[PDB]
Amino acid sequence: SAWRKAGISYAAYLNVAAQAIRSSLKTELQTASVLNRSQTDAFYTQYKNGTAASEPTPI
Amino acid sequence: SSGLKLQFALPHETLYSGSEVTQVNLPAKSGRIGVLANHVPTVEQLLPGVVEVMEGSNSKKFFISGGFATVQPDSQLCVTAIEAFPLESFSQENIKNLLAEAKKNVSSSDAREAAEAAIQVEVLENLQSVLK
Amino acid sequence: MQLVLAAKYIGAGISTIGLLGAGIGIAIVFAALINGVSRNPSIKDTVFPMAILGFALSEATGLFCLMVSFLLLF
Amino acid sequence: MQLVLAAKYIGAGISTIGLLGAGIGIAIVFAALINGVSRNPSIKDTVFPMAILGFALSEATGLFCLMVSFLLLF
Amino acid sequence: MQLVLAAKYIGAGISTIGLLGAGIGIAIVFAALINGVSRNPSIKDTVFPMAILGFALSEATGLFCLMVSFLLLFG
Amino acid sequence: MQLVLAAKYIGAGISTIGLLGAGIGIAIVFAALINGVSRNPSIKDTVFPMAILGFALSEATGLFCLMVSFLLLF
Amino acid sequence: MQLVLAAKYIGAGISTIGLLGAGIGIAIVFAALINGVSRNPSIKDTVFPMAILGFALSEATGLFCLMVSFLLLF
Amino acid sequence: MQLVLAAKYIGAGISTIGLLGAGIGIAIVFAALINGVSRNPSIKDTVFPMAILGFALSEATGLFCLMVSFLLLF
Amino acid sequence: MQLVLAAKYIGAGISTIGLLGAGIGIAIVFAALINGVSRNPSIKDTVFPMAILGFALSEATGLFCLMVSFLLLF
Amino acid sequence: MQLVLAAKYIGAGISTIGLLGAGIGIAIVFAALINGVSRNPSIKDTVFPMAILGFALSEATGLFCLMVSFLLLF
Amino acid sequence: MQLVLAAKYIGAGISTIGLLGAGIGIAIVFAALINGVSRNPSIKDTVFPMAILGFALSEATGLFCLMVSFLLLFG
Amino acid sequence: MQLVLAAKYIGAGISTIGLLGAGIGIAIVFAALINGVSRNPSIKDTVFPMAILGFALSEATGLFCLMVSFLLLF
Amino acid sequence: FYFMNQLTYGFLLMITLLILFSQFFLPMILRLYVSRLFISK
Amino acid sequence: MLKRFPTPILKVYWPFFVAGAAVYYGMSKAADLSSNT
Amino acid sequence: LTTFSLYTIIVLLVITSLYTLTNNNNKIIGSRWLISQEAIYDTIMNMTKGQIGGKNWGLYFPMIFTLFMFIFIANLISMIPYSFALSAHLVFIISLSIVIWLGNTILGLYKHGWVFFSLFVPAGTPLPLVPLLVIIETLSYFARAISLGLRLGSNILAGHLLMVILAGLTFNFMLINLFTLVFGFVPLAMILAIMMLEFAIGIIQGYVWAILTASYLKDAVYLH
User: Fold this and answer.
1) CA angle, corner B66, sides to B60 and B67, nearest 5?
2) Are the beta carbons of B96 and B89 closer than 8 angstroms?
3) Which residues carry this modification: Phosphothreonine (chain A)?
4) If exposure means fewest CB atoms within 10 Å of the residue's CB, which of B43, B113, F35, O163 is most exposed?
C-alpha cells in the first residue's frame, strides 16, 4: 500500500515486511537469530541541545 | 560476462555471492523481469514476491521480504534481500492467517501504524499465495 | 430501381467500415489483457472475463454494422 | 423521388460510420480498465462501474449514429 | 427539389460522424480517469468532477454534430 | 439554383467533418491534465488553467470548422 | 443492371477496407504478445492460446468484410 | 457557371478537412507540456514559449486550409 | 460497357487503401520486436519466430486486398 | 472548361489536406522535444536545432501540398 | 474512350494514398530502432540488419501498390 | 477530352494526400531521435547519420507520391 | 463599413478606462498597500 | 480613493494611437470605395 | 446611432456601476464588488509579469487589461434569445485584431527597425533554410492576427444561432406532443447546457485573447 505519505518511509515499510516474514516464519525456522531480530530495546532521547528532548522514546 | 552471477544476500547470512544462474525471476513494483545473461544495467525496487532462482539443477524458489533488484552493464545482478523463503519449510499457514486476522484489527490504529499494518497484511497475503 | 439499387450497394459497401472499429476494439482489449497478464500472472483470472465482455460488446457493435449493411442488400 | 431514396440510403450508410467511434472507444476504455486492474486489484471495485458507464456513453453515441441512420432508412 | 432533399440527406448523414469523435473523446477521458484512480486512489475525488466536465464537453460537441445533421435533414 | 444548393449542403457536411479533431484534441489535453495531476497532486493549480486554455483553443478550432460549414448554410 | 453492376464493383471496392483494420489489430495483438514475452518470458505459454483466440476474433472482422464484398460482387 | 460554383463549394468543404490535424496537433503539444510540467515543474517557465510556438505553427497549417477554402469560396 | 469498366477501375483503386493497415501492422510488430530485443537481448530466439508469423498474418490481409483488386481488374 | 475548372477546384481542395499531416508531425516533434527537455534540462541546447529544422521541413511538406493546390487553382 | 481513361486516372490517384501508410510504418519501425539503440548502445549490431529488413519489407509493401497504380495508369 | 482532364486533376488532388504519411513518419523519426538523445546524449553522434537516412527514405516515399501526382498532372 | 463613432470612440474608451483605473484604483490598491505597511511600522 | 496619482496615459502609448490614426486614414475610404448603396 | 454604438454606450453604463459607484468604505475591502475586479486585476497583473515582465511589463499593462475588460463585458450579456449581440456582424473583432497587429509592428519597426527582420530567424536555420523560415514566420504574423479576430466573433455568432435553432425545435416539440412528457424538457435541458457553454467560452476566450495579445507584445518588445 502507501508507505510514503500514509506510512513513514521505505525503511519502515521494508522493516515491517521483514517482521512479517520473521514472525510468520514456520516453527522449525524460529531460532535465536529471529528472536534477536524481533528483540529491540532502543531508546530515542534526541538530546535537547536547543530543545526537543524525546526522553528515551522506545524503538 | 559468461551468463549471469547473482549476489543474493540476507543480513543473517548471504545466500548467493555471484553463483552462476540460468535465469532469475524478480517480482518488482512494475513486474517480474527475466535476467539471465548480459542484459542492460537496471535499477528497480523488489516488491515482495517469489524470486525463483532457476538453475540447471532445479528451479528453486524464494519469496522475498523486499529489496532492490539492480543490474550492472558487466552482466552483474546485485539483488539485496532481507528474509528469504527456503524451499518450502517457510510455509506456515496457521500463524500467517492468525497474524492477518489479529492485526487487521489495528489496520486503522494510527496513520503510519495503520498503513504499515495494511502493508503487512498485504505481504501476508503474498505469503499465502506462496503458501499454495 | 437502377439508382436505388446502386445506392443500396454503395451504402452496404460504406457501412462495411464499422468492422474496422470492431476489430480495433477486440485487438487492443486483447493487447491490454496480454500486457496485464505478462505483468501480473495472478490478476489474469480476474481480468480474463472482463476482456471477454469487452470484445464481446465490440463484436456486437460490429454485428450492428453488419446488420445495417445487410439490410441495404436484402 | 428515386434520387431522394438513393441518397437517403447513401446517407444512412455514411452515418453508420460513427460506430467506429463506439468500437474503438469501448476498446480504449477496456484497455485502460485492464491496465488499472492489473496495476492493483484493490482499485478494481472503484474503477469498474465508471468504466462500464463510459462504455455505455460511447455506445450511446454509436446508437445516436445508428438512430440517425435509421431515420435515413424508414 | 428532389436533388436538394437528396443532398440534404447525404449531408446530414456525413455530418453525423461527429459522434465518433465525441465517443472517442469521452472514452479517452474515462481511460485517463481510470489510470489516474488506479495509480493514485487519493486523487480520484479531485479528478472525477473534472472528468465529468470533459465528458460533458466532448458529448456536447458530438450532440451538436447531431443537431447539425438534424437541421440538414429538416431544413 | 439546384446543383449549387446541393453542393453547398455537401460542402457544409464535409466541413462539419472537422469537429472530430476538435473533440479528440480537447479530450486528450484533458486526459494529460488527469495524468499529470494524478502523478503530482501539487501541480493542479499550475496545470489546470493551461489545460483549460488548450481546451478553448481546440474548441475554437472546431468552431472555426463549424463557421466554415455555416457560411454554406445561410 | 449495367449501372447496378458498376455500383456493385464500386461498393465491393469500398467494402474491401476492413482488412486494413483486421491486419492492424492482429498486429497490435502480436506486438503486445512480444513486448510481454520480452518482459516476462514465462507467460508465453499462458498468453499463446488467448492471443490466438484474439487474433481469430480480430480477423473475423476481415472475414465479414470479405463476405460483404462477395455478396456485393456475386 | 453553376457547376463551377458547386465545385467551389465542395472544394472549400474538402479543404476544411485539413484542420482536424491542426487541432489534434495543438492538443498533443499542450498535453506534452502538461506531462513535462508534471515531471519537471521547475522547467515550466523555460518550456512554455515553445508550446505557443507549436500552437501557432499548427494554427498556421489550419488557416492555410482556411485560405484554400476561402479562396475557393470568394 | 465503358461505365462498368470505369467503375471497376474505381473500385480497384479504392481497394488499395488497406495497404495503410498492412504496412502499419508490419511496422508495429517489427517496432515492438526491435524494442524487446534491445531491452532484452536474450529474448530474440523466441520472439523472432512469432514476430515473423505475426508479420505473415498481417500481410495476409494486404495480399488478399490486392488479390481482390486484381480480380476486379481482370 | 466548366468541368475542367470544377475539378481543378476539387483537386486543390483535396490537395490542401497535407497541412493536416504537417501539423500532426510538427506537433509530435514538439511533444517529444518537451518530454525530453523536461526529462533532461541539460539536453535542451543541443536538442533545439535539429528539432527546429525537422518540424520546419515537416511543415514544408504541407507547404508542398499547398503549392500543389495552388497550381491546381492557377 | 474518355471515361475509361478518366477512371484510370481516378483509380491511380486513389491508389497512390497507399504509400502513406507504408512510409509512416517504415518511419515508426525506424523510431523504435532509435529508441532501442538509445536504451542499448551495445545492441546496434543485432538491431540494424533486422530494422533494415523491416524497412525494405514495408517499402516493398508500399511499392506493390505503387505498381498497381502504375498499371492503372499505363495499362 | 475535358472529362479526362477533370479526372486527371481530381486524381492528382487525391494523390497529394500521400504526403501526410511522409510527414507523420519523418516527424516520428525526429521524435524518437529527440527522446533518445535526451535519454543519453552520447548516442546522438552514432544515430544522426542513420537517423537522417531514414528521414530521407520517408521523404523519398513522399516524393514518390508527389511525382506520381505530377506525372498525373503532366 | 460603419466605423466612425466606434473605433476612434473605442480608443477614447480605452483612454477613459486608463484614467479611471491607473489614476484612481491603482493608486487606491497602492495606497492600501503602503497604508498597512506603515501600520505595521 | 480617486486621488489622481499621475501614471503613463499617453507618453508610452503613442505607437498604437498613431497606428490607429493611420488606420483611420484609409479606414473611411474603404467604405467609400465599396459603397454598394 | 447604430446598434454597435448604442451597445457600446450600454457597455460603459455597466462598467462604471461595479467599482466606480461603490467608493465609500475607504478600505481595500468592505464590498465584495471590490474583491471581484482586484481578483481579475491581480490575475492579469501577475500574468503581466509572467509574460511581459523584465523591463516594461507594467508600462503596457493597461491595454491588455482594457482589452480584457472590453471582451469580458461584451461576452457577459450575450445569451438572451433576443440578444442581437454586436449587430450579428462582429466585424469590429476583426478590426480590433488588425489594429492590434498593426500597432504591434510599428512598435517593432520603431524599436528595432531593420532588426525586426532578424526576428524571423530565431536561433539557426542557415542561408539554405533562411527563405523557408522567413516565409513561414512572416506569413504566420499575418496568420494568427486575422485568426484571432475571426475565431471570437464567429463563435459568438455560432453560439447565438445555436440558441435560436434549438429554440425553434423546442417550439415544434411542445406543440405536437399531446400527453407524453419527455419531448420538451430534454431539449430545454440542452438549451440549459448550451447556454452555460456559451457563457463559459466567452470568459476563457477573453482570457485567451488577453494571453495572445500579451504574447505578441513580447515578440515586438523582445527579439528571440
Assistant:
1) 95
2) no
3) 51
4) B43
